[PDB]
């Protein structure tokens, strides 16, 4: 700043969510059930 104030723009217009990292690092409240396993599955053939 003009008076010596240490100014810094946060630059967080919710772009920091895309900038951030997604590593699990969590052994508590891990997703248990059906959708957690089904999310990582590639689509593949369909079943009738």
């Amino acid at each position: 700043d003009g008076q010596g104030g240490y100014v810094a723009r946060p630059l967080s217009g919710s772009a920091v969510a895309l900038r951030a990292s997604r590593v699990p690092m969590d052994h508590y409240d891990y997703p248990v059930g059906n959708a957690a396993a089904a999310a990582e599955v590639p689509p593949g053939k369909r079943i009738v």
Binding site: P43, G44, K45, I47, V48
Partner: protein, 430 residues
């Protein structure tokens, strides 16, 4: 993931693929614009936000048949640069489509195949749709086929070729073009499925009980043949059979890879309601000679190998029983050295029906694709047909001036004769 890439060369290729891609859109729910309202991956590329484009190319030197696709109801389906047009057609000249005017368009043709293969993640085969009797389907068909083998080695190529009939033909140098297209189709294609025109005319006359069909009606049920064999990649089944499984199960010798193909239930609307459709009846009708889509007698030759693309609500045991009844039928005959002779592939989806099409809905269907020694009479007639016209050098000056020499007609002659010698020596009992 499993994939397949289709190419369509010549007027017969585009019009068949016009009916094939019309069939494929209804099965996967693809709208004519290209947006659905997991199994589409084999034929469609999911582009951007919910738009699916076909994994095809429409190349033809004549622009008037490609331009029908451009101005038709599928202007938004295909990619615009994907369809390839030319200035002047080969016009029933194998010399023109392979040497003079087909050279300038095959370099652009390999550019789009390379882009489609790079977008592909696991490539399983190539679909080739052409007629060997036409100039573009033989000339440009061979040039595109031979460059694909060098660019993509040891890759399967399912070449569905329409051959001229002994009684039915519309271009005079079709026997000239068929022999020259045959000389390249042996060493390059991996599985070639012979098709004939007027056997489909006989099927529509008898089974469909309609007296006046056109080529639109032929290509619709031809599209059902293509969609029946490739359905196991897109949909599940009890005995899933892939493109890679066709070659080692239907090609015993490296030069004998011509296979007949038949569709068992081909029934009209009011006929099917009174008809009782079961697996035993359609299996008998599959091997019935008048249901064959090539004018050929299966009684004359020996069925070397056969695969059955069962679709719909077919349990694995009534197909098991129907094979046994077919095996004990004395009319058909297998070759002696192939005791195990049947490939069974069952899928769990009934075939779709096009609205406005002649076919009615059926619960179950069979696509009988078989390798037979009976196919030799098709090429024996064409050898007789070609030898008589070449005996006094008819229509040779149209080929000599545009690149080809006289010796290529001579060299292609024993290639059919070596093929004829191979059929008669492989059906011989030992």
């Amino acid at each position: 993931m499993r994939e397949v890439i289709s190419i369509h060369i010549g007027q017969a290729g585009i019009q068949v693929g016009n009916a094939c891609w019309e069939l494929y859109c209804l099965e996967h729910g693809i709208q004519p614009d290209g947006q659905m309202p997991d199994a589409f991956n084999t034929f469609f590329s999911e582009t951007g936000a919910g738009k699916h484009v076909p994994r095809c190319i429409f190349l033809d030197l004549e622009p008037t048949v490609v331009d029908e696709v451009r101005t038709g109801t599928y202007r938004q389906l295909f990619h615009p640069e994907q369809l390839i047009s030319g200035k002047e057609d080969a016009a029933n000249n194998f010399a023109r489509g392979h040497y003079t005017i087909g050279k300038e368009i095959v370099d652009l043709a390999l550019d789009r195949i390379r882009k489609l293969a790079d977008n592909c993640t696991g490539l399983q085969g190539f679909l080739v749709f052409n007629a060997v009797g036409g100039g573009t389907g033989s000339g440009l068909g061979s040039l595109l086929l031979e460059r694909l083998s060098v660019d993509y080695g040891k890759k399967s190529k399912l070449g569905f070729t329409v051959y001229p009939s002994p009684q039915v033909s519309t271009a005079v140098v079709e026997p000239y073009n068929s022999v020259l297209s045959t000389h390249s189709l042996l060493e390059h294609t991996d599985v070639a499925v012979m098709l004939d025109n007027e056997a489909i005319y006989d099927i529509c006359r008898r089974s469909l009980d309609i007296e006046r069909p056109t080529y639109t009606n032929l290509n619709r049920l031809i599209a059902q043949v293509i969609s029946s064999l490739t359905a196991s990649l897109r949909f599940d089944g009890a005995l899933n059979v892939d493109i890679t499984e066709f070659q080692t199960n239907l090609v015993p010798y490296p030069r004998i890879h011509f296979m007949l193909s038949s569709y068992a239930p081909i029934i009209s609307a009011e006929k099917a309601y009174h008809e009782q459709l079961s697996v035993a009846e359609i299996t008998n009708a599959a091997f019935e000679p008048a249901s064959m889509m090539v004018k050929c007698d299966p009684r004359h030759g020996k069925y070397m190998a056969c695969c059955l693309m069962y679709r719909g609500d077919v349990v694995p045991k009534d197909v098991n029983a129907s094979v046994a009844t077919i095996k004990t039928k004395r009319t058909i005959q297998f070759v002696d050295w192939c005791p195990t002779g049947f490939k069974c592939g069952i899928n769990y989806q009934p075939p779709t029906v096009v609205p406005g099409g002649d076919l009615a809905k059926v619960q179950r269907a069979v696509c009988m694709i078989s390798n037979s020694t009976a196919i030799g009479e098709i090429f024996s007639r064409l050898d007789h047909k070609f030898d008589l016209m070449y005996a006094k050098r008819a229509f040779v000056h149209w080929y000599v001036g545009e690149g080809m020499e006289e010796g290529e007609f001579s060299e292609a002659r024993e290639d059919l004769a070596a093929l004829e010698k191979d059929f008669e020596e492989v059906g011989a009992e030992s």
